[PDB]
Design a protein around this ligand. Structure first.
Ligand code: URI
Length: 121
């Protein structure tokens, strides 16, 4: 009766600002968990007024820019970002992303686009 398991095969997969997102389709007000694959960067800076963003780095290496501060990231690191923090990042990484409470695009604000040449990856 209750669906507990979600697969990649049945997920929604799309590119957003240079990252490949896997959105599984589960609904839970307390948190959203998605996969993020990135080859060079997330070429847009945004913030979320409600939700914290927590990235677990499965593999690879990159750099987060959090309110313009560089934060290097590598495999097995956890990057925790409070609400109302400007975010972008560069890197070649596979990550698991938690947005808590649940992701709502109406909570997000566009700051600026980032030139693809700005990524050193
Ligand atoms: O469920 C989610 C979680 C994050 N993002 C997007 O992922 C990027 C940051 O990893 C941002 O563009 C953010 O809007 C989504 O589209 N959906």
């Amino acid at each position: 009766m209750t669906k507990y398991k979600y697969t990649v095969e049945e997920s929604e997969r799309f590119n957003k600002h240079g990252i490949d997102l896997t959105v599984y389709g589960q609904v839970d007000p307390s948190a959203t968990v998605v996969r993020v694959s990135v080859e060079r960067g997330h070429f847009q800076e945004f913030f979320n007024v409600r939700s914290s963003y927590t990235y677990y780095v499965v593999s690879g290496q990159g750099v987060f820019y959090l309110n313009s501060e560089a934060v290097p990231a590598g495999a097995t690191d956890l990057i925790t970002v409070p609400p109302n923090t400007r975010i972008h990042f560069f890197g070649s990484m596979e990550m698991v992303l938690t947005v808590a409470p649940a992701f709502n695009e109406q909570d997000e604000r566009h700051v600026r686009f980032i030139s693809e040449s700005e990524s050193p990856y």
